[PDB]
Enzyme design. Structure first.
Site, PDB file in Angstrom:
ATOM      1  N   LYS A 124       4.666  -2.409   8.425  1.00  0.00           N
ATOM      2  CA  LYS A 124       5.647  -1.464   7.915  1.00  0.00           C
ATOM      3  C   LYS A 124       7.019  -2.116   7.965  1.00  0.00           C
ATOM      4  O   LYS A 124       7.525  -2.430   9.046  1.00  0.00           O
ATOM      5  CB  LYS A 124       5.644  -0.170   8.727  1.00  0.00           C
ATOM      6  CG  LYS A 124       6.462   0.948   8.102  1.00  0.00           C
ATOM      7  CD  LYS A 124       6.805   2.035   9.118  1.00  0.00           C
ATOM      8  CE  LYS A 124       5.725   3.105   9.176  1.00  0.00           C
ATOM      9  NZ  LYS A 124       5.004   3.102  10.484  1.00  0.00           N
ATOM     10  N   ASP A 157       6.438  15.544  14.354  1.00  0.00           N
ATOM     11  CA  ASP A 157       6.082  15.632  12.937  1.00  0.00           C
ATOM     12  C   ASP A 157       4.583  15.548  12.716  1.00  0.00           C
ATOM     13  O   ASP A 157       4.106  14.683  12.000  1.00  0.00           O
ATOM     14  CB  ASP A 157       6.776  14.544  12.127  1.00  0.00           C
ATOM     15  CG  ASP A 157       6.859  14.881  10.653  1.00  0.00           C
ATOM     16  OD1 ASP A 157       6.695  16.067  10.304  1.00  0.00           O
ATOM     17  OD2 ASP A 157       7.097  13.964   9.842  1.00  0.00           O
ATOM     18  N   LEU A 184       0.799  -1.219   0.000  1.00  0.00           N
ATOM     19  CA  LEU A 184       0.000   0.000   0.000  1.00  0.00           C
ATOM     20  C   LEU A 184       0.830   1.266   0.000  1.00  0.00           C
ATOM     21  O   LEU A 184       0.303   2.347  -0.248  1.00  0.00           O
ATOM     22  CB  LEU A 184      -0.918   0.012   1.220  1.00  0.00           C
ATOM     23  CG  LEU A 184      -2.025  -1.038   1.255  1.00  0.00           C
ATOM     24  CD1 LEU A 184      -2.870  -0.869   2.507  1.00  0.00           C
ATOM     25  CD2 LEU A 184      -2.887  -0.928   0.007  1.00  0.00           C
ATOM     26  N   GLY A 185       2.119   1.150   0.276  1.00  0.00           N
ATOM     27  CA  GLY A 185       2.934   2.340   0.380  1.00  0.00           C
ATOM     28  C   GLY A 185       4.360   2.265  -0.105  1.00  0.00           C
ATOM     29  O   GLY A 185       5.127   1.414   0.334  1.00  0.00           O
ATOM     30  N   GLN A 186       4.723   3.168  -1.010  1.00  0.00           N
ATOM     31  CA  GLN A 186       6.094   3.226  -1.492  1.00  0.00           C
ATOM     32  C   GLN A 186       6.774   4.216  -0.709  1.00  0.00           C
ATOM     33  O   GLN A 186       6.483   5.409  -0.757  1.00  0.00           O
ATOM     34  CB  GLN A 186       6.131   3.618  -2.965  1.00  0.00           C
ATOM     35  CG  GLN A 186       7.495   4.099  -3.436  1.00  0.00           C
ATOM     36  CD  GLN A 186       8.626   3.173  -3.023  1.00  0.00           C
ATOM     37  OE1 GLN A 186       8.397   2.043  -2.593  1.00  0.00           O
ATOM     38  NE2 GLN A 186       9.857   3.652  -3.153  1.00  0.00           N
ATOM     39  N   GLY A 187       7.720   3.757   0.093  1.00  0.00           N
ATOM     40  CA  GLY A 187       8.372   4.680   0.986  1.00  0.00           C
ATOM     41  C   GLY A 187       9.868   4.707   0.905  1.00  0.00           C
ATOM     42  O   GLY A 187      10.472   3.960   0.138  1.00  0.00           O
ATOM     43  N   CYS A 188      10.472   5.584   1.694  1.00  0.00           N
ATOM     44  CA  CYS A 188      11.915   5.673   1.722  1.00  0.00           C
ATOM     45  C   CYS A 188      12.365   4.957   2.954  1.00  0.00           C
ATOM     46  O   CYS A 188      11.742   5.074   4.008  1.00  0.00           O
ATOM     47  CB  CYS A 188      12.376   7.129   1.754  1.00  0.00           C
ATOM     48  SG  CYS A 188      11.679   8.129   3.088  1.00  0.00           S
ATOM     49  N   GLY A 247      11.999   2.014   3.487  1.00  0.00           N
ATOM     50  CA  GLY A 247      10.949   1.091   3.845  1.00  0.00           C
ATOM     51  C   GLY A 247       9.691   1.089   3.016  1.00  0.00           C
ATOM     52  O   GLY A 247       9.622   1.752   1.985  1.00  0.00           O
ATOM     53  N   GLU A 248       8.693   0.342   3.463  1.00  0.00           N
ATOM     54  CA  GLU A 248       7.418   0.247   2.764  1.00  0.00           C
ATOM     55  C   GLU A 248       6.360  -0.272   3.725  1.00  0.00           C
ATOM     56  O   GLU A 248       6.673  -0.833   4.778  1.00  0.00           O
ATOM     57  CB  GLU A 248       7.520  -0.655   1.540  1.00  0.00           C
ATOM     58  CG  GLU A 248       8.419  -1.855   1.754  1.00  0.00           C
ATOM     59  CD  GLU A 248       8.072  -3.023   0.855  1.00  0.00           C
ATOM     60  OE1 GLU A 248       7.013  -2.980   0.198  1.00  0.00           O
ATOM     61  OE2 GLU A 248       8.867  -3.987   0.809  1.00  0.00           O
TER      62      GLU A 248
END
Ligand code: L1N
Length: 247
Positions: A39, A119, A17-21, A23-24
């Site tokens: 995650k 944040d 569900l998530g393209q991350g930096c 990680g994912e």
């Protein structure tokens, strides 16, 4: 290890569900019966000490790389995506204020537990069914001056970001300080500039933002005050509200 550790085999990652930096994020099933979010991180936890209905719940963790952090599943993803999506256009001031109240209520818990998020932003609020919102993921445009310059992050710098988050909600997801790059934002905000009232936003809601953006951190309201003001907004502050064109 601790009682939060589980076996990776007990987890089943299904959809990404998530393209991350670094990680994912993946969706999946836990112990065969529970839908969860996982995650993954690519080569300590304050999330273990915090528990509240308005904070995304940790379920378990694999502390052996590949590292997996298992949390409750939020079915509509990020508040920012939700606002910039198909439905956001139908959100009116009552649903936007109630969302702000849930975030404030989560942040009041962080506040009286003596922690700091560092944040706070729509990107880090997760939406669920029934317009439920929860704070997660414990950026200069959302950071208080004293925090972005001197690293002085307190609950009162979170209160500053809360105000920016209110502008995100009342603009349906627009970025703060339109047309301004980071350096001009820090330069102008030091000289006293504050974002004006967004179109169709009641002045009393903008007044609350300005309170959040007072230079003195101690002069900024608490989340407990913010929660109560927003939960009671349409009775005590704007009893004569009428839906407009875009809000
Ligand atoms: O439908 S989607 O819009 N996109 C997609 C993409 C691919 C397939 C289907 N749909 C959506 C996006 C995110 C989402 N949920 C993510 C999280 C969750 O459920 N629990 C979390 C806990 C922490 C955390 N940190 C970063 S994300 C995250 C999440 C749910 C739906």
């Amino acid at each position: 290890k601790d009682a939060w550790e589980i076996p990776r085999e007990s987890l089943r990652l299904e959809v990404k569900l998530g393209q991350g930096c670094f990680g994912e994020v993946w969706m999946g099933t836990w112990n065969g019966t529970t839908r969860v979010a996982i995650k993954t991180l690519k080569p300590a936890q304050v999330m273990k000490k915090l528990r509240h209905e308005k904070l995304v719940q940790l379920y378990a963790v694999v502390s052996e790389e590949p590292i997996y952090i298992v949390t409750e599943y939020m079915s509509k993803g990020s508040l920012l995506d939700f606002l910039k999506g198909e439905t956001g256009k139908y959100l009116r001031l009552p649903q936007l204020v109630d969302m702000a109240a849930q975030i404030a209520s989560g942040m009041a818990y962080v506040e009286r537990m003596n922690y700091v998020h560092r944040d706070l932003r729509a990107a880090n609020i997760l939406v669920g069914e029934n317009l439920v919102c929860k704070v997660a993921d414990f950026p200069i445009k959302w950071t208080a001056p004293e925090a972005a310059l001197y690293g002085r992050f307190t609950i009162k710098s979170d209160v500053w970001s809360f105000g920016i988050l209110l502008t995100e909600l009342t603009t349906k997801g627009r970025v703060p300080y339109p047309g301004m790059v980071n350096r001009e934002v820090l330069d102008q905000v030091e000289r006293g500039y504050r974002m004006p009232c967004p179109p169709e936003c009641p002045e009393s809601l903008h007044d609350l933002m300005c309170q959040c953006w007072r230079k003195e951190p101690e002069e900024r309201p608490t989340f407990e005050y913010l929660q109560a003001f927003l939960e009671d907004y349409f009775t005590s502050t704007e009893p004569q509200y009428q839906p407009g064109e875009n809000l």
